[PDB]
């Protein structure tokens, strides 16, 4: 009986310590949001230059 109690306490300690690690790397989600929005916004900016140049060429 005593040995079983020892095992239970060790398992609880290890579970808490393991759960601590995953908390640290939580920053990745925000970086994904930032990069996605920035790239999406710049993509449409370039197309305007392309559009204006093509429109100018056709008239000549």
């Amino acid at each position: 009986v005593k040995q079983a109690s020892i095992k239970q306490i060790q398992d609880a300690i290890d579970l808490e310590k393991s759960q601590q690690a995953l908390v640290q790397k939580r920053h990745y989600l925000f970086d994904v949001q930032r990069n996605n929005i920035a790239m999406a916004l710049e993509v449409t900016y370039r197309e305007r230059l392309h559009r204006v140049y093509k429109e100018i060429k056709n008239r000549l």
Partner: protein
């Protein structure tokens, strides 16, 4: 040589015209107008110097707005 000089003389006679062909042609203008209309329709209507400039907003803006955010 004789035919060549005769044709040169007639080409110079054509050049003596003030402008356009000697025979303007009742249907030459009509054919030119039809061809021009066909070209305009195929290539699309275009003004002399019109340069429109209209910019749209950001399309389909994706966000992190959600109940679990």
């Amino acid at each position: 040589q004789k035919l060549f000089v005769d044709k040169i003389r007639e080409y110079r006679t054509k050049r003596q015209t003030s402008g356009g062909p000697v025979d303007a042609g009742p249907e030459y203008q009509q054919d030119l107008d039809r061809e021009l209309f066909k070209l305009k329709q195929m290539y699309g209507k275009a003004d002399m110097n019109t340069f429109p400039n209209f910019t749209f907003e950001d399309p389909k803006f994706e966000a992190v707005e959600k109940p679990q955010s």
